Paper text:
FMDV, a small non-enveloped RNA virus (genus Aphthovirus, family Picornaviridae), exists as seven antigenically distinct serotypes and many variants and sub-types. Structures of several serotypes determined at near atomic resolution have revealed a capsid composed of 60 copies each of four structural proteins (VP1 to VP4). A prominent feature of this otherwise rather smooth capsid is an exposed flexible loop (∼30 residues) on VP1, termed the GH loop. This loop and the RGD motif embedded within it (residues 145–147 in the O serotype) comprise a major site of neutralization by the host humoral immune response and mediate FMDV binding integrin89101112.
Subsequently, for O1M only, we tested the effect of 2 mM Mn2+. This resulted in more complete decoration of the O1M particles than with Mg2+ and the Mn2+ data were therefore used in further analysis. For each virus the two well-resolved classes corresponded to distinct poses of the integrin, for PanAsia these were termed A and A′ and for O1M, A and B. The integrin portion for these complexes was resolved at 10.8 Å (pose A, 4.9% of sub-particles) and 11.5 Å (pose A′, 4.2% of sub-particles) for PanAsia and at 8.6 Å (pose A, 5.9% of sub-particles) and 12.3 Å (pose B, 6.7% of sub-particles) for O1M (resolution assessment uses the ‘gold standard' protocol). Integrin binding in pose A is very similar for both PanAsia and O1M; superposition of the integrin based on the virus structure shows <8° rotation between the two. In this conformation, the integrin molecule is almost perpendicular to the surface of the virus, as might be expected for initial engagement at the crowded cell surface. At this resolution the cryo-EM density for the integrin does not reveal detailed interactions; however, there is density consistent with the RGD in the FMDV GH loop binding at the interface of the αv and β6 integrin subunits. The D of the RGD appears to coordinate the MIDAS Mg2+ in the PanAsia complex and as expected the structure is similar in the O1M complex with Mn2+. Unexpectedly, in pose A, additional density was observed bridging the integrin to the virus surface (for both PanAsia and O1M). Further, the integrin makes a glycan attachment to the virus in the vicinity of the HS binding site.
Author numbering:
A (entry chain 3): 1 to 220
B (entry chain 1): 1 to 208
C (entry chain 4): 15 to 39, 66 to 85
D (entry chain 2): 12 to 218
E (entry chain A): 1 to 29, 32 to 263, 265 to 503, 506 to 594
Write the structure that this text describes.
């Protein structure tokens, strides 16, 4: 006889992400050689970790301006990859096609003032649960860091990943409007003759940043 | 980590700088060969469809993520739901050779016919947006607005008509799907997420 | 290797399945691994 | 401890405010001996020198994103541009060097970037110009940015009359903030140079 | 109401030349002339068919209209065998504006080849003439070019002079038809002129810059008007933007010192709000009032049916900065009331400025109608005191009587401003003169007015019987401004018991008749003339009607034929002034 099989039910439908490869139809094709061709990347995080990209502030600008008044809050933006400030970043470009992430997010802070303007800043991480701090006195009790503008003009602060669950959603919830993943606040503490001068900021993937579960954003 | 702010070498101020430690990080779901070999829908014409990968839309996943690369190499396999007989033709044959059946037809087997095509381009690596001599471009001048503007948008379209995997021709294709495997990418380009008008782009996430 | 999930060998050989690549005679993984870390000056505890 | 004076051929370029050279996309050149040319290529060593050009005048009224896009190769009226009208297929790298000389009392910064195949950009796309071979210039730290890139392209040799692979892009990230003691207007120059050109295929003479 | 209609001045031109598409007065330094725009008139310019010309029409003596040479040349060349311009069908004379010695005419459809590629773009051009001088003024003919620049600007589509001798120019096609307001001082227009430079830069130029793409196709500069609105003396810029706000139409007002932005808006879709604008102080408060036209406006009647009648919005300028907007509707359907709006100055010399509004496609046989509206304290009197009718039939394009008009000019020195009406559809232009206004203080007194039937005072010659008599007395006094006779003869009529086929119970003594006429001749500005006479009651047994009051009626008529002057311009009596008055008398019991 012939080898009996059972044409099983429920199996064999076309799934769009399956590891089944299609049967060939036209063989014996030799490609032109491509070896040692410049500029190859393997994973999308290595582009996101080796190349930092700007943020967005009020006025469609990447820089934040020093403030010559009693209020000392330069910027105060919620921490999500669907935020308003993170929107033009490459890091939130590919995090629009996933569901959840983990790991650190590096923030790069380059000061573009003249050689006579000096200032010092701080950036703090306010974990969720109460209102974010509005003064650098109140934000001294976070996981913060300070730096002043001198010869090396760039500062990189790695945002810690604190969460209950092991992975956090990269899409902020549509109905839930409290943003219970966290805030990140950056202040100025003082400035000497630094009026009208800028602080261009950047963002990169961290050392241990890794995404998970790809879906289709579909320009939403 | 204080750095030299303009040298543009990579710096990663890790979380150990203020106490703590880093964990093991896995990056399989962001691999460029894993994220690109899944099926994507493109809109078909009635009969003749050149199998260009840059006719994938810009809102979908592997169309907006293929445009991350400047130069790409990937073998294509298609999956097309049609009626009649569907003849694939290699790169650069005359378009009168779509009717001939010596070219690799697939007879109609219900419901759809998926088949693996080789890289048939003459170039060593294809490209997402070739610009031989179409754009200057450091600041294009105001030319066409109003009615004429819609057609003026195709002025800057890609020209290497050799940037295709060939063409398929059936009686009426209904839905033909691309996926690209063994994908190699080169020279990254910017990738854009959509612009929030609120404090944060809050969309309705799935929930019980 | 890709998005394959089969432990069996392929049925069609190698050259009726893909297009064979030809040698003649990567970057951003080397770029992201040469990243500076630590500090720039004399740190304290 | 610093060697900060580059030269290409018989032309030198000494800068004292170099933060460093950035090798974009490769540290070494591709195999120039292709099979699409049958071994009829040859290196022209006399094309490797600098040539100066003017880009724009970065003034205090320029907002974010006043970009400038010049396609390389541009009109070279010397030895290199003679090869464009005398040989059909040629390939080369580039090592650009832009200068924005003000003084150490101006503010602001302008990003410099070598980007391949650049056309039809948006100002919302300018946020992520950092992905390319880039190097910032601010007057508080440096005056120059020195970027070096190899030949990229769809295929090994190129027809430069119908195709321009690279595009030197300078855009202004923070606006120029003059002070009581700074410089009012700075002018952005650049000296560009090819690296190891290889022509193949002699045109007939125009006579 | 005082405009002469009997024998108004008629002027004509070549048929098809659109003679009357634009009109103005020309008063130099001491003869008076008329400017008529004929944008389709053939010229002797080398190889230019229908270049269009402006004609200076001699008002003195004969009716001769001599053309004016602003430009006698043909198309200049950019290079060899490469024309720079296209003056053929350039519609020169489509808009003509004059101020003293300065005449400004424009060619909205003048096309121009770029200084780069070989294009044909309607930037429009103008020619400014100051007596012996004559320069060219093409502000839209610049380095900024086609569609998104000033290439399709059609500069000169509407023009106006300010009091500080500054030109206001409108171009509805700039920046993808956003439109543009351009203002230059007449000094630099000639001072910076250069026959070899096609794109002249003017140092003191005010202009509306390009705006967002959502402002495209709005047609700013479609029409223009000048007047002060911020109270600094300098004329500001009023312009209609008829396609703005999704075809609802708007009107912009910019500062005449720095082009700084009031803004009016329409109430109906596609009513063409802003097709025409006018600025004149209508209520004597020395605050310039805004008039906006919308000829396509549809109104509802008692039958509740929509009908296109046209509408003009009268916005009174208050010192508060606000406006007191009044809407005035058209009268005939599809007549496009409000197509042209022309300030007349004080037409009747009463103390308030007046204005004229036209329905060019109205009247019998689509001849055309012009309505005259008088100003007063409260604002503009919504009822027209005069209705000017076209007198010419159609050929192909309708007569369009009233499509363009100009007033506020005392061209005959009679103390009263006149009006030009252009009917380009029949290639005619008409000058209406204003007749002198005579105010008249008529009087009538009856004493005693309570008649005792048994009084019997005044004797009656012929009979021994005496009758109950009383006195009737009438007075005339007249005066007027401007040029008019110092002698004025009137015809006074008196009737006793005007209320009565019935029997009249009172008659005049020295005539025995209820009717009496008196040729009276009073003097202008002179004292009040007054003639009285005796009337008497009939006998008690001659009538039963003793309860009905005896009404004494006085009526007067002026001799217009003898009041005429030189040309035969006969004066007129003031409106709202009773041509007759009446007092009464009762009988007791
Ligand atoms: C009876 O019949 C006789 C004759 O018809 C009437 O005679 C009249 O007497 C009037 C009053 O005297 C007189 O008025 C005018 O002359 C007045 C002087 O004689 C003079 O004072 C008046 O001026 C004033 O008059 C006006 C009149 O409207 C009043 O309104 C003022 O208040 C002033 O009083 C007049 O100029 C009139 O002229 C005269 N007429 C005649 C024809 O003789 C008489 O009044 C009759 N009387 C009765 C019985 O009624
Ligand atoms: C008092 C007298 O004779 N009246 C007459 C009047 O009837 C006539 O109408 C007029 C004509 O001008 O001349 C006068
Ligand atoms: O995109 C919104 C943003 O656009 C631009 C300006 O109009 C800003 O005021 C505005 O906040
Ligand atoms: O500077 C303000 C200006 O910037 C740009 C746009 O966002 C405008 O809407 C805004 O008016
Ligand atoms: O949005 C920027 C834009 O804002 C508004 C104006 O001030 C323009 O001059 C400027 O270019
Ligand atoms: Ca003013
Ligand atoms: Ca007023
Ligand atoms: Ca009046
Ligand atoms: Ca008059």
């Amino acid at each position: 006889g012939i080898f009996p099989v059972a044409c099983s039910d429920g199996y064999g439908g076309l799934v769009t992400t399956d590891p089944k490869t299609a049967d060939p139809a036209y063989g014996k094709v030799f490609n032109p050689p491509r070896n040692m061709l410049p500029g190859r990347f393997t994973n999308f995080l290595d582009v996101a970790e080796a190349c930092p990209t700007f943020l967005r502030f009020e006025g469609d600008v990447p820089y934040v301006t020093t403030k010559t008044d009693s209020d000392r809050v330069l910027a105060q933006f919620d921490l999500s990859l669907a935020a308003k400030h993170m929107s033009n970043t490459f890091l939130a470009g590919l995090a629009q096609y996933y569901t959840q992430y983990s790991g650190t997010i590096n923030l790069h802070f380059m000061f573009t003032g003249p050689t006579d303007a000096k200032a010092r800043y701080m950036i703090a991480y306010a974990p969720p649960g109460m209102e974010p701090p509005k003064t650098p006195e109140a934000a001294a009790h976070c996981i913060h860091a300070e730096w002043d503008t001198g010869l090396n003009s760039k500062f990189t602060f790695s945002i810690p990943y604190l969460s209950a669950a092991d992975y956090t959603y990269t899409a902020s919830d549509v109905a839930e409007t409290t943003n219970v993943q966290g805030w990140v606040c950056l202040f100025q503490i003082t400035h000497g003759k630094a009026d009208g001068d800028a602080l261009v900021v950047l963002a990169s993937a961290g050392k241990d940043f890794e995404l998970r579960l790809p879906v289709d954003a579909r320009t939403q | 980590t204080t750095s030299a702010g303009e040298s543009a070498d990579p710096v990663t101020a890790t979380v150990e700088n203020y106490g703590g430690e880093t964990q093991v990080q896995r990056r399989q779901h962001t691999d460029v060969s894993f994220i690109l070999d899944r099926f994507v829908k493109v809109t078909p014409k009635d009969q003749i469809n050149v199998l260009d990968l840059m006719q994938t839309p810009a809102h979908t996943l592997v169309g907006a993520l293929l445009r991350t690369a400047t130069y790409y190499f990937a073998d294509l396999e298609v999956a097309v739901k049609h009626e009649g007989n569907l003849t694939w033709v290699p790169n650069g044959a005359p378009e009168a050779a779509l009717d001939n059946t010596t070219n690799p037809t697939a007879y109609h087997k219900a419901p759809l016919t998926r088949l693996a095509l080789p890289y048939t381009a003459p170039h060593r690596v294809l490209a997402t947006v070739y610009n031989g001599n179409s754009k200057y471009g450091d600041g294009t001048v105001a030319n066409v607005r109003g009615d004429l503007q819609v057609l003026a948008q195709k002025a800057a379209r890609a020209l290497p008509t050799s940037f295709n995997y060939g063409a398929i021709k059936a009686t009426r294709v209904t839905e033909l799907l691309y996926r690209m495997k063994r994908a190699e990418t080169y020279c990254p380009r910017p990738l854009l997420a959509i612009h929030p008008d609120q404090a944060r782009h809050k969309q309705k996430i799935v929930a019980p | 290797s890709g998005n394959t999930g089969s432990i069996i060998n392929n049925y069609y050989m190698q050259q009726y399945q893909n297009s064979m690549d030809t040698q003649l005679g990567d970057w951003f993984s080397k770029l992201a691994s040469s990243a500076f870390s630590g500090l720039f000056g004399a740190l304290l505890a | 401890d610093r060697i900060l004076t580059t030269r290409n051929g018989h032309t030198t370029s000494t800068t004292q405010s170099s933060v460093g050279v950035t090798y974009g996309y490769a540290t070494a050149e591709d195999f120039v001996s292709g099979p699409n040319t049958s071994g009829l290529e040859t290196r022209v060593a006399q094309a490797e020198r600098f040539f100066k050009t003017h880009l724009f005048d970065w003034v205090t009224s320029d907002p974010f994103g006043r970009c400038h896009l010049l396609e390389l190769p541009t009109d070279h009226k010397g030895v290199y541009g003679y090869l464009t009208d005398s040989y059909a297929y040629m390939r080369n790298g580039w090592d650009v060097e832009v200068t924005a000389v003000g003084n150490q009392f101006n503010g602001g910064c302008l990003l410099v970037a070598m980007v391949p195949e650049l056309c039809s950009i948006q100002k919302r796309e300018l946020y992520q110009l950092t992905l390319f071979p880039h190097q910032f210039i601010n007057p508080r730290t440096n005056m120059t940015a020195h970027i070096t890139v190899p030949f990229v392209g769809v295929n090994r040799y190129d027809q430069y009359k119908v195709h321009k692979p690279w595009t030197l892009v300078v855009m202004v990230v923070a606006p120029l903030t003059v002070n009581s003691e700074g410089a009012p207007q700075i002018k952005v120059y650049a000296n560009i140079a090819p690296t190891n050109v290889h022509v193949a295929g002699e045109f007939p003479s125009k006579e | 109401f005082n405009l002469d209609v009997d024998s108004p001045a008629e002027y004509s031109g070549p048929e098809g030349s659109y003679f009357g598409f634009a009109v103005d007065f020309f008063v130099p330094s001491s003869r008076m002339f008329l400017l008529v725009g004929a944008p389709k008139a053939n010229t002797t310019q080398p190889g230019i068919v229908e270049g269009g010309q402006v004609l200076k029409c001699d008002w003195s003596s004969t009716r001769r209209c001599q053309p004016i040479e602003f430009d006698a040349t043909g198309n200049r060349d950019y290079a060899k065998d490469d024309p720079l311009e296209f003056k053929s069908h350039q519609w020169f004379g489509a808009s003509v504006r004059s101020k003293q010695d300065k005449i400004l005419a424009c060619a909205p459809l003048y096309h121009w080849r770029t200084e780069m590629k070989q294009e044909r773009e309607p930037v429009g051009t103008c020619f400014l003439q100051d007596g012996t001088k004559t320069v060219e003024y093409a502000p839209c003919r610049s380095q900024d070019i086609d569609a998104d620049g000033q290439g399709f600007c059609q500069g000169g589509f509407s023009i106006d002079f300010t009091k500080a001798d500054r030109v206001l120019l409108g171009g509805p096609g700039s920046f993808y038809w956003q439109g543009q307001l351009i203002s230059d001082q007449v000094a630099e227009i000639v001072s910076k002129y250069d026959p070899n430079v096609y794109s002249i830069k003017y140092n003191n130029q005010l202009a509306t810059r390009t705006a967002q793409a959502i402002f495209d196709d709005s047609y700013l500069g479609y029409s223009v008007a000048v007047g002060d609105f911020n109270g600094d003396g300098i004329d500001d810029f009023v312009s209609g933007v008829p396609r703005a706000a999704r075809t609802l139409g708007m009107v912009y007002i910019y500062d005449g010192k720095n082009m700084s932005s009031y803004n009016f808006t329409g109430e109906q879709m596609a009513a063409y709000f802003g097709f025409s604008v006018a600025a004149t102080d209508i209520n004597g408060d020395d605050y310039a009032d805004v008039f906006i036209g919308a000829p396509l406006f549809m109104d509802r009647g008692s039958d509740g049916k929509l009908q296109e009648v046209g509408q003009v919005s009268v916005s009174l300028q208050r010192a508060s900065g606000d406006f007191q907007t009044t809407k005035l509707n058209g009268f005939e359907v599809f007549a496009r009331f409000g197509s042209a709006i022309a300030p007349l100055g004080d037409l009747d010399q009463d103390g308030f400025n007046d204005i004229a509004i036209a329905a060019p496609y109205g009247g019998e046989d689509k001849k055309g109608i012009v309505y005259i509206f008088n100003g007063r304290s409260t604002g503009l009197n919504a009822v027209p005191s005069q209705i000017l009718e076209g007198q010419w039939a159609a050929r192909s394009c309708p007569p369009s009587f009233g499509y363009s008009m100009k007033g506020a000019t005392d061209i005959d020195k009679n103390g009263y401003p006149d009006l030009i009406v252009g009917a380009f559809g029949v290639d005619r232009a008409i000058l209406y003169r204003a007749r002198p206004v005579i105010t008249v203080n008529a009087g009538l007194e009856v004493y005693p007015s309570i008649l005792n039937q048994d009084n019997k005072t005044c004797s009656l010659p012929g009979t021994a019987l005496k009758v109950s008599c009383f006195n009737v007395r009438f007075c005339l006094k007249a005066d007027g401004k401007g040029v008019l006779p110092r002698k004025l003869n009137f015809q006074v009529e008196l009737l006793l018991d005007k209320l009565k086929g019935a029997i009249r119970r009172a008659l005049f003594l020295y005539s025995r008749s209820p009717s009496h006429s008196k040729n009276m001749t009073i003097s202008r500005g002179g004292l009040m003339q007054c003639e009285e006479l005796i009337a008497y009651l009939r006998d008690e047994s001659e009538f039963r009607d003793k309860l009905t009051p005896i009404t004494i009626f006085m009526e007067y008529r002026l001799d217009y034929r003898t009041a005429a002057d030189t040309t035969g311009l006969q004066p007129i009596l003031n409106q709202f002034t009773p041509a007759n008055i009446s007092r009464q008398a009762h009988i007791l019991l």
